Amino acid sequence: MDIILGIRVQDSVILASSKAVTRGISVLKDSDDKTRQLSPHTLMSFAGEAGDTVQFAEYIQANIQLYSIREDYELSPQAVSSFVRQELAKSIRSRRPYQVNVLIGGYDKKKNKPELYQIDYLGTKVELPYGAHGYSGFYTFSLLDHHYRPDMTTEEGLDLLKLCVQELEKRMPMDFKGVIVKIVDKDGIRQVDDF
């Protein structure tokens, strides 16, 4: 799929992901949620080749949910991100590699800190204050470089995110039919229904 964004503020991580699904010449759907909850305090958004994206995301989801049940314990965002990176780093030298890029947004309940990880299909992981995949970063990183402040509130983060989406809607050729926004904090994961 197309555009996926992420930003880490003072006390939360905010992920924004486009709603459009285009197969060829027509937009088959304009309300698609390009994300899966891996655990109560960890969310993963994804974008890449058709089919591979969902198949990979649900495969990861199943594995983390299996771990949660077995140990009766939630893995840290850092631990989940490392598991995901290894699966992609294994994948890249396979017969048919997973063609999927992801953002992992989670709140570490031990350290009481939000964390955002960016991982591409090769298995290239980086921890960031704000990140993006595909052509999204080409427009948005300049704005975030200017405005972001580490100690921003969640409301300030959403306003800075609106400024990013507005720029994308102005300068990107593809109509991505807006974005679904989700917040990850100490209380868990919730969706902003009006954006």
């Binding site: 027509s26 058709a50 089919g51």
Partner: protein, 212 residues
């Protein structure tokens, strides 16, 4: 090919064309592009004729085994995912499939899944699949409402295929209609485009471009 399916008050409408081509050569005008998987599930066919037939027929065998094992009707979600997981195993090998899996259960309500040989699986209210999908979308999007009568919904589906049959060179032949309700699907006849076009033109006052 033009195939469509949409959710509404009275359940689901499914409508398909009948044409099959090899290059510019019209191979068949009488193709059955709707598969009767069971009395409650329908599958549409677009892309490779063999791929779609074989695997959607196979598909009914897996569902029959599910309800034998679980003593319960299979869900449309589980149904569509069996197909999507299967084609994902063959990804890269060159399968060519564009399909809707349509049905109705107590727990789900009327449900439509778009399933694709790339592995794409999408739930949704309206879908159009095939070479003439864009033509059908035009008619649907401008006339669709949730509050449609079974009679009016059937006609909208019929009319949308007709639109695409006219303009798309690789669509045509005839229109097969199905209506999916609480108590299963109901076939609503084969409609030859050669007769349907002139009938619709006269009664509806449309296609003023064409001479008749």
């Amino acid at each position: 090919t033009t195939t469509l399916a949409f959710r509404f008050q009275g359940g689901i409408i499914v409508a398909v064309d009948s044409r099959a081509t090899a290059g510019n050569w019209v191979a068949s005008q009488t193709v059955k592009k709707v598969i009767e998987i069971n009395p409650f599930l329908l599958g549409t066919m677009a892309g490779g004729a063999a791929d779609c037939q074989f695997w959607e027929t196979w598909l009914g065998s897996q569902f029959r085994l599910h309800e034998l094992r679980e003593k319960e009707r299979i869900s449309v979600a589980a149904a569509s995912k069996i197909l999507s997981n299967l084609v994902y195993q063959y990804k890269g090998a060159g399968l060519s499939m564009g399909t809707m899996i349509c049905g109705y259960t107590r727990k789900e309500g009327p449900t439509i899944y778009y399933v694709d040989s790339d592995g794409t699986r999408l739930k949704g209210d309206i879908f159009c699949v095939g070479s003439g999908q864009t033509f059908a979308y035009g008619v649907l999007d401008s006339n669709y409402k949730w509050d449609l009568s079974v009679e009016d919904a059937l006609y909208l589906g019929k009319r949308s295929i007709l639109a695409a049959a006219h303009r798309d060179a690789y669509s045509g032949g005839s229109v097969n209609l199905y209506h999916v309700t609480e108590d299963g699907w109901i076939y609503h006849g084969n409609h030859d485009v050669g007769e349907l076009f002139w009938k619709v033109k006269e009664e509806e006052g449309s296609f003023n471009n064409v001479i008749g």
